[PDB]
Amino acid sequence: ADSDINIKTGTTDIGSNTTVKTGDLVTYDKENGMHKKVFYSFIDDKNHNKKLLVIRTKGTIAGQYRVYSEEGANKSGLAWPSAFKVQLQLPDNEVAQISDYYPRNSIDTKEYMSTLTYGFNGNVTGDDTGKIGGLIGANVSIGHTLKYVQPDFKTILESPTDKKVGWKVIFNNMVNQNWGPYDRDSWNPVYGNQLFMKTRNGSMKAADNFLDPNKASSLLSSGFSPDFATVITMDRKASKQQTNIDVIYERVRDDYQLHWTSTNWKGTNTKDKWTDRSSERYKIDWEKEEMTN
Amino acid sequence: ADSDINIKTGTTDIGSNTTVKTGDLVTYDKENGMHKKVFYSFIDDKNHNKKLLVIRTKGTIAGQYRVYSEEGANKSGLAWPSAFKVQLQLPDNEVAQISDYYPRNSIDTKEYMSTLTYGFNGNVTGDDTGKIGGLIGANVSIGHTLKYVQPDFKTILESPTDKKVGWKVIFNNMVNQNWGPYDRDSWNPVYGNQLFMKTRNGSMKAADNFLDPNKASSLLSSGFSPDFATVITMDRKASKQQTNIDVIYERVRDDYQLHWTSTNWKGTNTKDKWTDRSSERYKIDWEKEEMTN
Amino acid sequence: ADSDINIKTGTTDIGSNTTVKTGDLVTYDKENGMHKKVFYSFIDDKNHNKKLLVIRTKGTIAGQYRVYSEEGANKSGLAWPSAFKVQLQLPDNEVAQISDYYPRNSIDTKEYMSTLTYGFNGNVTGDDTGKIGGLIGANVSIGHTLKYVQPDFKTILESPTDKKVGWKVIFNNMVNQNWGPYDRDSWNPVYGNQLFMKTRNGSMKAADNFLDPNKASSLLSSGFSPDFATVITMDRKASKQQTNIDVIYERVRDDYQLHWTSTNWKGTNTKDKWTDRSSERYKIDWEKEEMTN
Amino acid sequence: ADSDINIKTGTTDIGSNTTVKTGDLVTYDKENGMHKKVFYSFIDDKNHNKKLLVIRTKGTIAGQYRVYSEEGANKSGLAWPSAFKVQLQLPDNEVAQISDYYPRNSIDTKEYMSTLTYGFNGNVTGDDTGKIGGLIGANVSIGHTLKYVQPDFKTILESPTDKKVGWKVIFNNMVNQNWGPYDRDSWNPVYGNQLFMKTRNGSMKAADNFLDPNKASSLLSSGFSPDFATVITMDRKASKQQTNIDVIYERVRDDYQLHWTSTNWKGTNTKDKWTDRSSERYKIDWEKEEMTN
Amino acid sequence: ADSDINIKTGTTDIGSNTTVKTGDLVTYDKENGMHKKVFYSFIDDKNHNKKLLVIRTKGTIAGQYRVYSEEGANKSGLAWPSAFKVQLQLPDNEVAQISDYYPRNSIDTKEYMSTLTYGFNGNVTGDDTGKIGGLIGANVSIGHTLKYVQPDFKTILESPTDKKVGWKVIFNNMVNQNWGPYDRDSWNPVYGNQLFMKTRNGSMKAADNFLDPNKASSLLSSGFSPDFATVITMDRKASKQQTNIDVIYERVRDDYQLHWTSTNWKGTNTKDKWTDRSSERYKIDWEKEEMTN
Amino acid sequence: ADSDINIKTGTTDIGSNTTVKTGDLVTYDKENGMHKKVFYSFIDDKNHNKKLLVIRTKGTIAGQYRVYSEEGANKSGLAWPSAFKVQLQLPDNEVAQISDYYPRNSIDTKEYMSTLTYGFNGNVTGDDTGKIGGLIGANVSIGHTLKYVQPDFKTILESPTDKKVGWKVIFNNMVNQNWGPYDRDSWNPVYGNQLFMKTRNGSMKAADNFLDPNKASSLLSSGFSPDFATVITMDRKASKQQTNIDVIYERVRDDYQLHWTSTNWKGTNTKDKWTDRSSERYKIDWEKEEMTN
């Protein structure tokens, strides 16, 4: 921070004594169930060697936890969103560049603890028949413990460039009714993948044996609300003072199926079965400090 | 945040140098027991490309934990609120759009820890008759521990669009007299669903074997006080500067019954039996910056 | 909050550039031992569609943990406060309405923990007689841990309306000399309810066998000091700029009885035996911005 | 708080744009070892309906943990402060009233933890004689855990009125050399009350078996420094603008004795043996905003 | 605080609109190894009824953990600082008084938690010989645990008067090489007091068996750096505006003795063996607002 | 900090009353997949003896975790980034020097806890035949647990000079599918290094037995974003006010090999196989206060 290098806090930041022009661009893609809202801010700091544009991609991408298929009373399919993606892309012929972005990748941590314990014990015995026993034992013990946190979903910043940037919220793993946690690769030889299995040998039909959405992660059904920030820099003396930028909201759905084997239920999950891509193009006008679609 | 992208804190926020006009609209629906209060704020920032209207839905929806059917000393009914919902909706013919909202869906986490232990022990034995003995053992053990937090009720942002948004507070589970927790799908083959039974084999009237409301979550009896924020954008060049918006407060109640099977009590819970819904129509006037109903 | 919807912090709040009129009204009710102080503030924000009055009810209601009765050396009664209530009430003919209130009901939480363990062990025995033995064991375990917080008293907001609002602080449970916790419903077939029993056996008389007030919750004897906020809105165009409002402090006392069974002490608690109600009327003058009584 | 009711923070507070006149009044009572300092502040806010006077009682009441008696080599006495009190009261004929106070009584909490465990274990035995054995067990466990904090001393607000207010800091319990904790009622069949005995069997003089004040709570020896706040309101049109107020500092000491029983030491404690009281009178002048003694 | 009593934060505080005079007085006592620095500030608030002088006693008193006596490989001594003190003292004839001080005595706390578990188990037995066994067990266990923090040194405010105040930081206990802790009273029949013993049976010179100063509390060797605050009040009408004040830094050292018993070492600590005092007199000139020594 | 030495906070900081000139320099090295952004700020404080240039190296270095070689169906390589580095170098002939830098090296800590527990127990036996037994045991136990936090990657400030400074983020260890953690040196004789081995013994191609990048640290695949800051000073009277500075981004990749031994997979990792260097030169002009590349 500034104070760590003996500099007055805030001295190095941009935006002082500048008139900032903001805007809201709202769009709903009905077929894909994506409410897309772009909040941009033009920052022209006369003391900065560049012209800045801050784009915050907000809104909500519907999860759509739906039972899509039903092949009789002993087979049914459940489509669930396994990844949510947001991307901004500048045509390679533009002179604008992607300067900064947030959030970024964080370094994980884990808590480790060792334990060494040893003791002794002596027991004296006897009975009514004047018997006398004895016992002198010992023991040693070595232990290891590993603690770490497991989020249900992961927020990952995909390797960016000066002309593209993107994030993807992916499924990590979930707890099913206090047991697990199960992930996309969990496999039990008798029941297979029990990710969204309600009961292991219930008597109802396949369509009625899936975990209730209210008891799973809210992102599966309700959807995920992004909050990402991208900063675009443009040179003040560039001939072309107009830029086009593409914003893509994307959802990747897997296919989880239950089939009844006449003894118990057996799950199966197939990765990256469907992709819902919703793209839109906006025009950046650096001279007027306005953005439109 | 702005600090993370080397921008002065608060540079990109809206509302600076703007005269904000606020107001309160209070209404009580006697029949449904819903005290509704709408607090709005017109924000017209000449540096923002659109006009803003922030609507905060406040108040409280009575829980109404009640013993409704006192059908003797062997059976009785209890009606409890299993979900509370607040929904705003713009007519599809409106030009205004829903720009932002709060709270949204957060990502759940879970703490995981693995234990690996192994030790050894020796024992020397004997007695008065000169007998001697020995014992040399070993052991290994593998532990897993999963820890996470479970609220009694969930706050869920339902998939929004540019024309409607809503939230729902649903019953997750509850602890009943130091044991549990139980939920709407709990089932014990002997007693059934013990969610709201006071005593397992208590010789009183069915109307008297229900958990004391002071011992259950306060939201069941007293009611739930929403605090939601939704901001509506509007183009300054729109043809019609008046908008209509509907606000719905509704409560869904389940049906829990105690019947005595001549040894003990048996509990049964029926989902989403009743629905209480209070709807209102409000008029937004963007030119005068005032809202009425 | 405001920063979450990209709005400048504090933009939507009321009170900016307004002259606020405050006051104190103090009263002591000697019969019911209630010191009542009402602190109001008149907020007339020209940018608000209504006029505001913020009423804070403060002070303290004495507990009066008392040995009221003594029927000989074998039976004695203890009166303790089981609930403290504060209520504000507007006549239904009034045009003013109750807008907001604090504190409200909060969602409780619990912490769940699951543990799965399984190890192995082998032992090799022997003695001086050239004997040889063995042991190959296995084991599995499944643990469930539930953790949650239990306040001694609960603060509850009772379902409000546009003419009435109230709170109640009810007794939840208490720890008696490191045992328990016990509540109003605790029962033991030998000793009965041991809420305030000092000793299970004693040559002392009944009056000397009750828990020392310094060893119990300070609210039982010293008293409870409320701190509540009620906001009352009034329409500027209303014909009557005078409003009456009733403020009611109230204490409900139970009856805990001890009696000697010639072997041990027996305790019983009778719910809601007495009710100390202290009501007072204040007059609000919206034109001069002052309350009186 | 004010932000919870959509009100600009600090709008409803008193004191803005007011000239505050303060003062220090210091007095030492040598006989009781009490250093008394009274810090007052006159706040005349023309937007408040009454005058305000804020009195903070400070200083230090010496503990005086001492060995007062010495019965040669077998009995001895130790006088320790079991309670410290600070009280302010106006004559019942005064027109001023006590408006507010701090600190008030807080609600205690406790942490609960329920554990349910069940597991299985199998054993296979054998020896050199071709013997074979078996073992198949099952177990269950039901745990409870209660956790709460126990301060060495309690700060209690006595039931206040419009003419009297006071606080008392009482001895709750104490840990003696990593054992206990003991309180004023701890009793051991052979040793009695071990509150302040150094050694249970140690052969010394009675005057040398008491715990060293550096090892007990610092409030016993060094003394307790109060910090309390009281607010007195006065009507601007009251006939007489002078008020008298009495401030009392108290210390109540118990009597702990050790006697030798020819095997060990036997401790005994007698509650509230001695009371040290220091009363002082101050004059309040509301016209000049001045206080004297 | 002020916000607790509905008063604007900071309204009551002293020092508003006043010119403050500050100063430093640095002195080193070579004999006693005490670097003494006094930092005073003169505050004359025209809205305060008396003048103020804030004296901060700073600097550091060298520990001087040194092995002084060397009597051959059999015996040796170690002088260590067992207490550090700082005192301010006004001559009795002065009219100025001591008004406030910091830090003060605080109330210690502890964590108490009771546990109650009970389980059942059954074991079936058998062998090749058609033998059958059985076992039905039960158990119960009540636990108690106590948790509290122990600092190496205690900061104690000695009972103040209006003419003198003082503090003292005393040795509480210390952990020696991962085991202990040990205080000045710790005694073992074999080794005695192992406070500063490096090894139980090392065959080195007694001067070489003492704990390495880097493995002990840094205050023993490096020294203790006080930071105390004392505020002196003075009447504006006082006849004499000149005051004398004494500032005393003193260190008390104990005597730890190690001698060889031909099998192991023996520890012996003699309380309060030595005492170093460094007194200095300063002059306070209330008219010029300056202090000198 | 300043408050610790009785100095007004921020008094000794740089930047007050200065016009700061900032800039952004963005570059993308496509071959090495490095998005490099340099954010500089010129601070010319007239009260500072030298000029300042605060360089912040930001951007993202792609991880590029991928299967570089599939040597049939039982031999495959995986190239993963073991260390990421950032360097700034001033040519030896420059008069400017490196003044400060952040982050720096911090001292690690660990929690240590020594347990000592002992007990006693007695058991009385019997049977139907009149047989009587006895048992009296004693035990003792000495424990030591160590606990510390260890991140997946460690960020290290390399020994800097007045002409160059650098940082390196090195792989510490990682948990593989709830077990481990493994590092570059982990070695199991049966399976070798299991760092990125998906299954200990499956039946698939070696290219299909590597840990899924979504289950590994995000830095391995997505990349690492430096947030490193460097301060450069320059004399105002220096002969020439131009300076060249080199900025280097690096990525060192190890080589992980899987080979099938017809019983199980065997992993092996060879440290620092490859090095990716991306260097760039910038020109610093202290007169215009601008930086170019």
UniProtKB/Swiss-Prot annotation, chains A, B, C, D, E, F:
It comes from the Bacteria. The keyword Ligase does not apply. InterPro entries: Aerolysin/haemolysin_CS (IPR005831), Bi-component_toxin_staph (IPR003963), Leukocidin/Hemolysin_toxin (IPR016183), Leukocidin/porin_MspA_sf (IPR036435). PROSITE patterns: AEROLYSIN. One of its GO terms (molecular function) is toxin activity. The keyword rRNA processing does not apply. Changing H259L: 46% of normal hemolytic activity, slowly toxic in mice. It is found in: Secreted. GO terms for biological process: cytolysis in another organism. Pfam families: Leukocidin (PF07968). Changing H35L: No hemolytic activity, reduced oligomerization, not toxic in mice, no effect on ADAM10 binding. Gene3D superfamilies: Leukocidin/porin MspA. GO terms for cellular component: extracellular region. Keywords: Cytolysis, Hemolysis, Secreted, Signal, Toxin, Virulence. The mushroom-shaped heptamer is composed of a cap domain (comprising 7 beta sandwiches and the amino latches of each protomer), 7 rim regions whose protruding strands may interact with the membrane bilayer, and the stem domain (52 Angstroms in length, 26 Angstroms in diameter) which forms the transmembrane pore. Belongs to the aerolysin family. Alpha-toxin binds to the membrane of eukaryotic cells (particularly red blood cells, RBC) forming pores, resulting in hemolysis, with the release of low-molecular weight molecules leading to eventual osmotic RBC lysis. Human RBCs bind much less alpha-toxin than do rabbit RBCs. Heptamer oligomerization and pore formation is required for lytic activity. Self-assembles to first form a non-lytic oligomeric intermediate, and then, a mushroom-shaped homoheptamer structure of 100 Angstroms in length and up to 100 Angstroms in diameter. Interacts with human ADAM10; this interaction is required for toxin pore formation, disruption of focal adhesions, and hly-mediated cytotoxicity. This is Alpha-hemolysin.
